[PDB]
Write a protein that binds this ligand. Structure first.
Ligand SMILES: Cc1cn([C@H]2C[C@H](OP(=O)(O)O)[C@@H](COP(=O)(O)O)O2)c(=O)[nH]c1=O
Ligand SMILES: [Ca+2]
Length: 135
């Protein structure tokens, strides 16, 4: 897995943001995780959704540099969103959210699961510390 540079265009919510990648604007969806909904009416504004968005927004907006790391499987989903692990100054946003109890490990589709165990151990810690979603 190789990391690549990207430029923040705009954070949309907890697990989705728009980045300029290879000179092209794209919406990215964080791999292996799911932050609560704040958009789709079929779900509504789920508890901790606004919090997860604020965390992600803060994290990506304050970074000196952003990198995207694709897994080994497909790089986009059916909606055309780039599927990656996003890093803000070397810190993985996907793991950060799970560690704070602001996201649950979800959508694990082989072979795009290289970091599954790492995220699972962080989720177990958030759970034991009874953080946010796990409170
Ligand atoms: C994280 C991820 C989501 N998805 C899909 C599954 C869901 O399909 P459906 O929308 O048809 O349920 C949706 C979840 O994303 P959101 O959390 O952004 O809604 O995106 C993938 O296909 N692959 C992925 O790797
Ligand atoms: Ca979501």
């Amino acid at each position: 897995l190789h990391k690549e540079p990207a430029t923040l265009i705009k954070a949309i919510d907890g697990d989705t943001c728009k980045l300029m990648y290879k000179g092209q604007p794209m919406t990215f969806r964080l791999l292996l995780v799911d932050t609560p909904e704040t958009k789709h009416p079929k779900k509504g504004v789920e508890k901790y959704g606004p919090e997860a968005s604020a965390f992600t927004k803060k994290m990506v907006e304050n970074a000196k540099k952003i990198e995207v790391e694709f897994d080994k499987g497909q790089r986009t989903d059916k909606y055309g969103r780039g599927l990656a692990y996003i890093y803000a100054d070397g810190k993985m946003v996907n793991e950060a959210l799970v560690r704070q109890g602001l996201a649950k490990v979800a959508y694990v589709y082989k072979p795009n699961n290289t970091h599954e165990q790492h995220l699972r151990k962080s989720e177990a810690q958030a759970k034991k510390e009874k953080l946010n979603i796990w409170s």
